Design a protein around this ligand. Structure first.
Ligand SMILES: NC(=O)c1ccc[n+]([C@@H]2O[C@H](COP(=O)([O-])OP(=O)(O)OC[C@H]3O[C@@H](n4cnc5c(N)ncnc54)[C@H](O)[C@@H]3O)[C@@H](O)[C@H]2O)c1
Ligand SMILES: NC(=O)c1ccc[n+]([C@@H]2O[C@H](COP(=O)([O-])OP(=O)(O)OC[C@H]3O[C@@H](n4cnc5c(N)ncnc54)[C@H](O)[C@@H]3O)[C@@H](O)[C@H]2O)c1
Lengths: 286, 286
């Protein structure tokens, strides 16, 4: 009777992520109704155009009570605002609510704080990959889709979303929200800080040393490519992952001081071991 | 009469660089004789095999006196050892001697110190791109070939090498040796330090946080790719470019402290400006 399952999914935010999720849902559940919220007119019209969503609104509340599942695909701060607004609406009995934040822990806390006395389910989501024009059914193919449980996640919450989202072709993973934030700090957020700091360093140096622009090669290009990212999103990741990111920055300063001491001592064997060991590690992840 | 020009070029070190240079020479000057030095037997035999060089030796002195041009393509410290040995040989009148070091300033100083009373010419070289098996006539195509003058560079030294090396299809550039070291510190050597420190950081973190290996994506891969490089060469670059590299490391620590202060203050507008400005700079080099 999978043919006959009915569902209304409300996606708030029809940017790249929200719209691509809509496309992944419809891919495996062609009969589910998708209803959309979006602030700006442009992304909302495209969405309506390409049958990505069946109805759309600029009033967040308008579709809330009707939804069997609500996915909040707006930035991190607005996700919390919308959680605040969902907390005093009369929503469907046991709606499953979820987000799509790059950082799990703060959003989960906000959900537990605001929704604890509502008959709702909540779980944190992070679909690990622009606007509704860049919408792509295959955005998440073979990428990890992370769930982070909350005290409002019931035994069936993750299973129901995993069924809902099967059309993404993602790899599902359950992980503690704080632990998620710790890991992604190290392999994504702090690297972005470094790439941005390095670009700014080299750019400052450039004004005073003209061959800088010209001698930069594949090494430098590759370590600065992610500097190109959107600053609103990176700012809210830093402000919602402060502790982990600060810890990485402080640990990285200590590592630079070890390297600087080795250079001052002209310690050739230690400097060699420093380069060799890292080379080996690289080869050993994978 | 370019048909009739005779020349003997002595290349010491038949690794990737020395052998590829030999191939680039023969490409435009098929009648020049190339004679080769190499320590280990393997790279020397390949070289003899593929007609990359016409004669070869494991005794550095054997070809020195005969050469019209000597190119030292061994590592940075051995280049200085060989400069020491060339200083008390009777070389051809006005031989042009040059190196291929990743760092110009120390090698140029050593040449001026050791060779000042010999009737020789010297100029520093850095052909900005493994062993004699990885030898490639096109290694340097459209890459910068740097010359750094010494008090032993005569008016015709750079012109004679530029003619000699035309088959590389490189882009010639003349730059002060110290200034070269300053620039390459910023866009290559210090980035390599950072990439190696970051890999080691993430690798240490990994042992204690298992999802690290799995969540690392294109961002992290790209900033750590050059960690894969050979530690002997990177060590001698650091030990011959100490001042510039230490200056970058100290300046980078100060930039991390600014970023860390912004995060602690939750200064959202400043953190945004920090990401946006770097994004713009990236776009503005090119
Ligand atoms: N882009 C990625 O690589 C990625 C990956 C995984 C998760 N995420 C998360 O998803 C969020 C959205 O990402 P996206 O790539 O869809 O960006 P996007 O720019 O394509 O879409 C952003 C959406 O949020 C809405 N919005 C922004 N500010 C708002 C506000 N003040 N009030 C009401 N609506 C507002 C927009 O109109 C738009 O619908 C991110 O901020 C991030 O936490 C992003
Ligand atoms: N590989 C690059 O990206 C690159 C680019 C430009 C310049 N350089 C410079 O050229 C040098 C050589 O680079 P390569 O890529 O040809 O490396 P390679 O490993 O392919 O060749 C190194 C050569 O040096 C010889 N050698 C090493 N130690 C020696 C010693 N102790 N005594 C006598 N001979 C010794 C080897 O037998 C071999 O011929 C580098 O160390 C660097 O300064 C390298």
């Amino acid at each position: 009777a999978a043919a006959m399952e009915e569902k209304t999914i409300y996606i708030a935010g029809l940017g790249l992520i929200g719209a691509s999720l809509a496309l992944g849902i419809k891919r495996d559940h062609p009969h589910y109704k998708i209803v959309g919220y979006n602030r700006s007119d442009r992304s909302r019209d495209i969405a309506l155009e390409r049958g990505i969503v069946d109805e759309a609104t600029a009033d967040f509340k308008v579709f809330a009570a009707l939804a069997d599942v609500i996915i909040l695909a707006v930035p991190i701060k607005k996700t919390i605002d919308f959680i605040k607004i969902l907390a005093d609406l009369d929503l469907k009995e046991d709606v499953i609510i979820t987000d799509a934040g790059s950082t799990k822990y703060e959003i989960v806390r906000a959900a537990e704080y605001y929704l604890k006395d509502k008959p709702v389910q909540f779980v944190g989501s992070h679909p690990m990959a622009s606007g509704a024009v860049a919408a792509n059914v295959n955005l998440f193919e073979n990428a990890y889709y992370i769930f982070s449980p909350s005290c409002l996640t019931k035994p069936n919450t993750i299973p129901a979303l995993q069924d809902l989202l099967s059309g993404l072709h993602a790899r599902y993973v359950e992980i503690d929200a704080a632990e998620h934030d710790c890991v992604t700090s190290q392999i994504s957020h702090f690297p972005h800080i470094i790439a941005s700091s390095l670009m700014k360093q080299a750019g400052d140096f450039s004004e005073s040393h003209e061959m800088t622009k010209h001698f930069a090669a594949g090494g430098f290009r590759d370590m600065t490519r992610i500097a190109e990212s959107e600053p609103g999103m990176w700012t809210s990741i830093l402000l919602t992952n402060q502790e982990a990111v600060l810890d990485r920055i402080e640990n990285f300063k200590q590592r630079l001081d070890e390297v600087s001491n080795l250079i001052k001592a002209r310690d050739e064997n230690a400097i060699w071991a420093f380069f060799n060991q890292s080379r080996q590690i690289r080869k050993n992840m994978e």
